[PDB]
Design an enzyme around this catalytic site. Structure first.
Site, PDB file in Angstrom:
ATOM      1  N   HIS A  45      37.229  35.722  42.298  1.00  0.00           N
ATOM      2  CA  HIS A  45      36.647  36.447  40.943  1.00  0.00           C
ATOM      3  C   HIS A  45      37.832  37.580  39.698  1.00  0.00           C
ATOM      4  CE1 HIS A  45      33.557  36.154  37.852  1.00  0.00           C
ATOM      5  NE2 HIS A  45      32.412  37.120  39.188  1.00  0.00           N
ATOM      6  N   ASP A  93      35.091  32.681  47.028  1.00  0.00           N
ATOM      7  CA  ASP A  93      35.576  33.615  46.246  1.00  0.00           C
ATOM      8  C   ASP A  93      37.277  34.710  46.955  1.00  0.00           C
ATOM      9  OD1 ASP A  93      36.371  35.559  44.152  1.00  0.00           O
ATOM     10  OD2 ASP A  93      34.127  36.966  45.032  1.00  0.00           O
ATOM     11  N   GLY A 186      34.247  47.397  40.513  1.00  0.00           N
ATOM     12  CA  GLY A 186      35.344  47.450  41.158  1.00  0.00           C
ATOM     13  C   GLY A 186      35.927  47.540  42.195  1.00  0.00           C
ATOM     14  N   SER A 188      35.407  45.010  44.117  1.00  0.00           N
ATOM     15  CA  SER A 188      35.469  43.662  44.208  1.00  0.00           C
ATOM     16  C   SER A 188      36.716  43.092  44.521  1.00  0.00           C
ATOM     17  CB  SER A 188      35.776  42.576  43.028  1.00  0.00           C
ATOM     18  OG  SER A 188      33.925  42.168  42.814  1.00  0.00           O
ATOM     19  N   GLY A 189      36.966  42.433  45.596  1.00  0.00           N
ATOM     20  CA  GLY A 189      38.302  41.666  46.031  1.00  0.00           C
ATOM     21  C   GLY A 189      38.732  42.906  47.717  1.00  0.00           C
TER      22      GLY A 189
END
Length: 240
Positions: A45, A93, A186, A188-189
């Site tokens: 994403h 994702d 922020g 994310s991942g």
């Protein structure tokens, strides 16, 4: 990270900062997990938009020279073949980034311990979420690396209409939802460190939160269950 505390430099040394070249300078967009000296595990994403990415290992203060940073470019982006941007609720994702060069492992830069394929944690399992994400809903990025105690919410409970419903797939991990602590824009991942057999392993890849906001009671931070993709992660790294 909403409702989090400041981490210790050496605490979480697999945590990377995925930055994009915002014209003149570099901007923090996401988190990540250094799995090999040249491989990085993040959320698909994050790498949707064709930008110029760099990965910074050994980061602590985004805006300040920590003296421990390594700046490396991303030569190759492998997004999970089933990743459909418009359906983040479908899962998949997860992305793998082959760094332009290998990083030098020290006490600030280590490899992220991956879980055994198919490993499901029990409800309330002790996990931590780290990242430089928004400290408040619609707030601003944290200068220093924030950490928060986000225990797990199993599938049974997380798929309750009172929770997420069918939005969450078995391929996901839910943590938090207390309304005080969570993940935010922020993070994310970036990685959900869970304490198994006295060892911290990266069980989750920060995917999404509630459109209503980050720290919403019964809306726990949804992670991409790393243990489901172990096979894929290995296949990609070996064919590369």
């Amino acid at each position: 990270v909403v409702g989090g505390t400041e981490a210790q430099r050496n605490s979480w040394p697999s945590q990377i900062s995925l930055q994009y070249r915002s014209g003149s300078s570099w901007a923090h967009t996401c988190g990540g997990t250094l799995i090999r000296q040249n491989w990085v595990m993040t959320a698909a994403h994050c790498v949707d938009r064709e930008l110029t990415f760099r990965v910074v290992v050994g980061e602590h203060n985004l805006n300040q020279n920590n003296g421990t940073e390594q700046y490396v470019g991303v030569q190759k982006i492998v997004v999970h073949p089933y990743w459909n941007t418009d359906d983040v609720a479908a899962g998949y994702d997860i992305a793998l980034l082959r760094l332009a060069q290998s990083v030098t492992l020290n006490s600030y830069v280590q490899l992220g311990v991956l879980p055994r394929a198919g490993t499901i944690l029990a409800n309330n399992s002790p996990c931590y979420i780290t990242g430089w994400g928004l400290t408040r809903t619609n707030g601003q990025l944290a200068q220093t690396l924030q950490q928060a105690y986000l225990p797990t919410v199993d599938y049974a409970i997380c798929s309750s209409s009172s929770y997420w419903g069918s939005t969450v797939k078995n391929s996901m991990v839910c943590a938090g939802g207390d309304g005080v602590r969570s993940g935010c824009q922020g993070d994310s991942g970036g990685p959900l460190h869970c304490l198994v057999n006295g060892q911290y392993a990266v069980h989750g890849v920060t995917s999404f939160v509630s459109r209503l906001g980050c720290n919403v009671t019964r809306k726990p931070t949804v992670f991409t269950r790393v243990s489901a993709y172990i096979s894929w992660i290995n296949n990609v790294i070996a064919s590369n």
